[PDB]
Design a protein around this nucleic acid. Structure first.
Ligand SMILES: *P(=O)(O)OC[C@H]1O[C@@H](n2cnc3c(N)ncnc32)[C@H](O)[C@@H]1O
Length: 641
DNA sequence: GCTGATGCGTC
DNA sequence: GTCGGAC
DNA sequence: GTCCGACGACGCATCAGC
């Protein structure tokens, strides 16, 4: 009755009798917040899915128009990714709004949020000074979702103040745990332990057990009750795969949910199908730590090795009639930023090609020296809408897959055929569009040599893909069907540095109550100063991270040492007496606009930082004076050539 | 009209 | 992007 | 193996402050 007592984790949950609102009423936001509470309290994904499914079943049975907003709230998304809605709110705006809503000084709010590792706990445990004696009406799920979208659409001068007004308005109306999850959503850290795959599982379960479109009151609130547990499990798995394969081809809830409510899940693939112009989920890669692990994973299946190019994924759609769209790995519209690519499409496809979807890597290309350029150069291209004459950094497309051709979806076709269609129907032009360099072999010596060659040829390593056995493009069956093999995955291979710990950052979320990250430095011999080089936040086990907290607590300083230079780096929450030296691995070294390490040795204005740094081990046997020097950092950077 | 801080989207 | 935790 | 969320560097786009 009262949503404060809503229990979507209840045994024998009844979508009508155990809901906390009446038929046709708007889903209360507190119903969603209580569902989030029950999800965050458990560690078993399957239990989270069951709890979310219970909420969704009540939404279907009682208030179907609120299904879409509740789903977006559970994902902390604003809409389909290709539409590009973004809150434009981060911790800065959010903390100011919290401080204003609660009438507290910003620095008190900021300090509390850092100590607690969560803005939600700060917003929830303080009253709002704007509340009247009688509170405003309870928040609804659709109302909150619409206010999030209101925030996202505010743009231009003075828009921040307007966003804050909306946020404060939400907090004034919050009850019980609502402010916790409003704040977490706005900060982008809902951190339920449940995300896209679990939401899809909950959704297919919900609409299977409680079909949409029933005359009220629904005659069928639990369509699994007549089945054995075994038969029910098989049925829910099959229905889950129908939703998942459709979603992977059309990852757009605005399209799927109306179809689901009107026609049901079994008819879904007849209404939502892969098509050029609608972005799809890309195939991802599993990191593989050696050629021996490749063979263990693929066993006897024939596979191909391809250079792993160091650029940005570009999913290129050519629609029947000639329109071209380009999407990112995360279904964002990138059409506007590749006018050069769009103008070259007639040049890459044979005239018999009427439509396609290509999987490519966009790589920065130096036309004067005719060679690949680093990722850093690629990222200096403009974004959003770009006219063709603005292009300064040229791009070469390295094509490696073909997902659709002349009206045929290739999702269920083996790579051997997809690749043959790619190779035969498209045209290579050096420095503009070329097929990924590849090798079909099972010889370990050739693969190892090919990996070495890929690095010499300006690539990150190898992608490995089966050709015929489990070699389709069905993301719903396995999203990480390809293997990525990089030299820095191998123990003893790659650049490891010994770096000095000079600061620590309080942890957030799963790291709340300990350190979440650390500031590291190299030793500049010429100035006898430690220079910040990067932050570090992955590579340690939970046990190692607790050990770090124990070993570093005695090194906390109230002020920095005068021989430690960090320039523009984020000031650590705790300064540390330089003493601990850690072994750190990276994929590459980058020219940094922030970090002072080795500034002046390779570039006059820019120091050097680490790409993909991770903790390996503590160097008990090293003092800071024996850490990697800034001169050694510069030498490492130069030999990347 | 310019700049620094911040958000967001790439890896 | 890398990584470790929970299942 | 899957799923998830801790955390990394970087640069364009945006907007408050000037
Ligand atoms: P991530 O580091 O997980 O690796 C996957 C991405 O690598 C890029 N890529 C470059 N070259 C290839 C080939 N030949 N095949 C597949 N993927 C490649 C893509 O942008 C992936 O997203």
């Amino acid at each position: 009755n009262d949503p404060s007592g809503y229990n979507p984790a209840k045994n024998n949950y009844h979508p009508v009798e155990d809901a906390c609102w009446k038929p046709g009423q708007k889903v209360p936001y507190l119903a969603v917040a209580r569902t989030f509470e029950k999800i965050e309290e458990v560690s078993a994904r399957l239990r989270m899915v069951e709890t979310l499914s219970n909420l969704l079943r009540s939404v279907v049975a009682l208030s179907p128009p609120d299904l879409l907003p509740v789903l977006y709230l559970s994902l902390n998304h604003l809409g389909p990714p290709q539409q590009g809605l973004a809150l434009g709110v981060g911790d800065g705006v959010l903390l100011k709004a919290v401080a204003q809503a609660t009438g507290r000084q910003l620095e008190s709010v900021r300090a509390e949020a850092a100590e607690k590792g969560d803005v939600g706990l700060v917003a929830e445990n303080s009253r709002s000074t704007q509340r009247l004696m009688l509170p405003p009406p309870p928040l609804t799920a659709s109302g909150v979702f619409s206010k999030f979208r209101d925030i996202a659409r505010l743009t231009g001068s003075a828009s921040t103040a307007k966003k804050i007004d909306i946020i404060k308005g939400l907090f004034v109306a919050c009850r019980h745990s609502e402010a916790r999850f409003i704040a977490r959503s706005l900060s982008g850290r809902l951190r339920l332990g449940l995300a896209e795959q679990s939401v899809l599982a909950a959704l297919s379960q919900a609409v299977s057990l409680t079909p949409p479109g029933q005359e009220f009151p629904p005659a069928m609130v639990d369509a699994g009750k007549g089945k054995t547990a075994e038969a029910r499990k098989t049925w829910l798995e099959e229905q889950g795969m129908i939703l998942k394969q459709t979603f992977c081809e059309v990852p757009d809830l605005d399209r799927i949910i109306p179809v689901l409510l009107e026609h049901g899940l079994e008819r879904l693939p007849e209404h939502c199908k892969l098509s050029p112009g609608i972005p799809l989920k890309p195939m991802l890669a599993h990191p593989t730590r050696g050629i021996s692990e490749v063979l263990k994973r693929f066993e006897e299946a024939a596979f191909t090795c391809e250079y792993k190019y160091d650029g940005q994924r570009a999913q290129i759609h050519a629609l029947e009639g000639g329109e071209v769209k380009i999407f990112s790995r995360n279904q964002a519209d990138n059409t506007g930023k590749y006018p050069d690519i769009i103008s070259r499409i007639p040049k890459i496809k044979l005239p018999s090609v009427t439509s396609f979807i290509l999987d490519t890597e966009a790589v920065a290309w130096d036309r004067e020296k005719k060679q690949i350029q680093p990722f850093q150069v690629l990222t200096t291209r403009k974004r959003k809408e770009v006219d063709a004459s603005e292009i300064q950094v040229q791009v070469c497309l390295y094509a490696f897959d073909l997902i659709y051709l002349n009206g045929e979806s290739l999702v269920r076709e083996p790579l051997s055929r997809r690749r043959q269609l790619l190779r035969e129907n498209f045209v290579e032009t050096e420095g503009e569009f070329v097929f990924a360099t590849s090798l079909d072999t099972k010889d370990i010596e050739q693969i190892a040599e090919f990996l070495e060659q890929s690095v010499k040829d300006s690539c990150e390593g190898l992608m490995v893909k089966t050709l015929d056995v489990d070699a389709t493009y069905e993301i719903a069956k396995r999203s990480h069907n390809w293997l990525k093999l990089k030299k820095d995955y191998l123990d003893g291979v790659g650049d490891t540095l010994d770096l000095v710990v000079i600061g620590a950052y309080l942890g957030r979320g799963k790291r709340a109550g300990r350190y979440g990250g650390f500031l590291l430095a190299s030793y500049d011999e010429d100035s006898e100063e430690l220079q910040a080089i990067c932050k570090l936040g992955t590579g340690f086990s939970d046990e190692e991270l607790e050990e770090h907290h124990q070993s570093l607590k005695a090194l906390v300083l109230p002020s920095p040492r005068p021989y430690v230079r960090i320039d523009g780096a984020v000031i650590p929450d705790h300064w540390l007496d330089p003493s601990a030296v850690w072994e750190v691995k990276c994929a590459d070294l980058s020219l940094s606009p922030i970090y002072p390490a080795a500034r002046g040795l390779v570039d006059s204005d820019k120091g050097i930082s680490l790409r993909f740094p991770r903790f390996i081990r503590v160097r008990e046997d090293k003092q800071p004076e024996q850490a990697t020097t800034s001169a050694q950092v510069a030498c490492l950077y130069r030999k990347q050539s």
